[PDB]
Structure 1
Amino acid sequence: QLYYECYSDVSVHEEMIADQVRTEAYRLGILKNWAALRGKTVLDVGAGTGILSIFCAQAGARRVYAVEASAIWQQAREVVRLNGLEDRVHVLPGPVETVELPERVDAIVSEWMGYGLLHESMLSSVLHARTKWLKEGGLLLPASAELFVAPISDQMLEWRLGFWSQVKQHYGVDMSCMESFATRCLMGHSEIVVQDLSGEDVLARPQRFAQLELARAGLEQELEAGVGGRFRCSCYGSAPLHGFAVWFQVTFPGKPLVLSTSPLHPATHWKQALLYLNEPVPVEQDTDISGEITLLPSPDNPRRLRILLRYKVGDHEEKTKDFAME
């Protein structure tokens, strides 16, 4: 009959496990590496409720170290025991940067990805653990990530902006002047917005603007300096351009299994990271759009994602907008 403060805690973990695209991609990606994991030792970075660590045991791992800093580590220990794996899977509380493992490991598994790939992500902790605890020639799951961008005409946003001009049709009162107000409020800000889109929102072929091989020399320094690159595309047809969507995929080594968060693919809890222009720009078929996207740490907090956008639409002058996570 006591009162507890853990609603967010359960909601977050519920969302992740109920994300079948995510959870089944990890289950299968781990099983696909059975030959490399059989009789070997694994470190799970940010193990949460422990389900990926148990998948590793089920793929044949001799021993798994499940490291989790948040309050939820306690529930992981109970889940391990319930599945009869308390002698194979060891739950260790606290950050992986200072945990003491009794041995180096053959593999690191982690669901480290955040909104826009790098918002409040565990990637820096995975790389720290790779340097400190992974044996030479050891395995990282997933092994790589790719970043994508596309111009968008967000159909839900279009409806919200146009709503005010439609009030007269429904109630006999003209409220069309509310449209400029709504545009300022919904687009005239510099926050990254997390929202799920579909193919109906995508205005040109998506462009890959970066590829991250997670084991590669120098990646820690690239993350600090900024990850990204240039892009170019041509519009499919006539629409209000609202800005750009950014998303990612990750790949599990083997034919490789890919977990995608594209709006063209099955929805996931990551959705997409939307970068709105200050106001809509009309485009037509074959309107050329080019630009550059850079994912950066925020200066107050390297864990909060910043995105610097440069973009040029048709014959308009190149523009810049500097975003930070909502």
Structure 2
Amino acid sequence: DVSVHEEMIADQVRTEAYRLGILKNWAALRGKTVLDVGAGTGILSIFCAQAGARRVYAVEASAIWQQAREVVRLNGLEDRVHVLPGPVETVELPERVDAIVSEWMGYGLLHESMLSSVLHARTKWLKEGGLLLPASAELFVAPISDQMLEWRLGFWSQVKQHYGVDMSCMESFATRCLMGHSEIVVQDLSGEDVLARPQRFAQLELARAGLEQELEAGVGGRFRCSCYGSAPLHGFAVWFQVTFPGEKPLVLSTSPLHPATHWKQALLYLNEPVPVEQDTDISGEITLLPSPDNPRRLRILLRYKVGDHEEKTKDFAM
């Protein structure tokens, strides 16, 4: 399971955003106490120590918690950073904390996310008015024309001019097995894939009352946009940003218009591509939900209407 951890640390967008987001709240943190929810190899808890926190409680449910303690002691912080195995729901802290830091976002923000555990620790261990790092998250959606997908698909109709065998029929086949499903696809896109202006359909203040509730009811909203031009619409892409309070706030973004993160994007393919043109109106509603299977697994309910085609519904799951 190392691959997941090198991928995080090699994500300098993620790592620096947190380093700086923590540093810039040095005033809120200095000589105070932090709870790091899901500390992994512990780097965040050490950032907090370096921002002058008097004491940091690094709680990590997985086996990797042993590296963190090893990472803490190697960094000379066995005295102020305390690593604690076990889920945060039942860990026992000696005191309540001034701030929670956590890297809880999963793919599509909420897949296999620790947001619930963060809120739990907020209720149970965070002092009144306490700090949350990051403090909010915004969710975005844009229609896409996946350039990688168009290449994969249209390629079978290219085989003739490369080897002299017509394999055009395989494009139907490819489409059905690449788009005619309802899984959520994690793929990194670029701006060249974006087909209308990105629309922010939800905002979560982490500290706000009722958030655990909405997480269970479904997080989302409606959206409306106009295509940039003519292409096959392949579906939609969802991503997020999280914001650290400052001064001007530090934002960590996973948009395809911004530098690539390990989160990439969550793609919602239609069952087949749709020809769109300049100023084709697309609207709909998009909802992130727990799976009845397993709330750890992200469900996304999409209702969309393309131009004046009839409105459709597609129900995705990770």
| TM-score bracket for this pair, using the shorter chain length | over 0.9
1:16 CA drift (Å): 0.1
SS at match of 1:184: helix
Please give the per-residue CA displacement for 1:201-255, whole angstroms capped at 9, x wherever unaligned. 0000000000000000000000000000000000000000000000000000011
> 260, 283, 308: which is aligned to 2:301?
308
Deviation at 1:104, TM superposition (A): 0.2
User: 2:243 matched to which residue of 1?
Assistant: 251
1:155-204: CA deviation from partner (whole Å, max 9, x where unpaired): 00000001100000010111101110010010000000000000100000
Q: Describe the SS at the equivalent of 2:120.
A: helix
3-state SS of 1:230 partner:
strand
In 2, Cα distance between the equivalents of 1:145 and 1:170?
47
- C-alpha distance in 2 between matches for 1:284 and 1:239: 7
Give distance in 1, aligned partners of 2:44 and 2:103.
8
1-structure distance, mates of 2:224, 2:86: 44
* Deviation per residue, 1:230-285 (Å, 9 max, x gap): 00000000000000000000000011000000000000000000000000000000
Q: CA deviation at 1:26?
A: 0.2
- SS state of the match for residue 236, structure 2? strand
Please report how far the alpha carbon of residue 318 of structure 1 lies from its aligned counterpart in structure 2 after TM superposition: 0.2
TM-score (norm 2): 0.99
* Distance across 2 between alignment mates of 1:12 and 1:280: 33
| 3-state DSSP of counterpart to 2:20 | helix
Q: Deviations over 1:105-129 (max 9, x none)?
A: 0000000000000000000000000
Q: Offset at 1:137?
A: 1.2
What is the alpha-carbon root mean square deviation over aligned residues? Answer: 0.3
Distance across 2 between alignment mates of 1:256 and 1:204: 26
Counterpart-to-counterpart distance in 1, 2:144 and 2:150: 11
User: Which residue in 1 is equivalent to 2:278?
Assistant: 285
1:103 Cα deviation from its structure 2 partner: 0.2
2: CA distance, partners of 1:175 / 1:301: 41
Query: Aligned to 2:251, what secondary structure does the other structure show?
Result: strand
Aligned partner of 2:16 in structure 1 is: 24
Deviation at 1:300, TM superposition (A): 1.5
- Structure 1 counterpart of 2:317, from 309, 315, 324: 324
Aligned counterparts of 1:28 and 1:310: Cα–Cα separation in 2: 38
Provide the C-alpha distance between the structure 2 equivalents of 1:141 and 1:173, rounded to a whole number of angstroms. 57
Cα distance in 1 for partners of 2:169, 2:9 equals 44
Deviation at 1:298, TM superposition (A): 0.2
Please give the secondary structure, in 2, of the residue aligned with 1:191. Answer: coil
* Aligned residue number for residue 255 of structure 2: 262
Per the normalisation by structure 1, the TM-score is 0.97
| CA offset digits 1:268-326 (Å, max 9, x no partner) | 0000000000000000000000000000000011110000000000010000000000x
**Aligned pair count?**
317
Alignment-derived partner of residue 71 in structure 2? 79
| 2-structure distance, mates of 1:166, 1:137 | 61
Offset of 1:20 from its aligned partner?
0.2
Cα deviation digits, residues 48-88 of structure 1 (max 9, x gap): 00000000000000000000000100000000000000000
How many percent of aligned residue pairs carry the same amino acid? 100
The separation in 1 between residues aligned to 2:75 and 2:299, in whole angstroms, is 41
3-state SS of paired residue (2:293) = coil
Structure 2 residue matching 1:274: 3-state secondary structure? strand
Runs of 5+ unmatched residues, structure 2: none
In 2, Cα distance between equivalents of 1:181 and 1:10: 36
Q: Secondary structure in 1 aligned to 2:184?
A: strand
Cα separation, 2, equivalents of 1:104 and 1:274: 40
Question: What aligned pairs does 1:68-107 form with structure 2 within 5 A after superposition?
Answer: 68-107=60-99
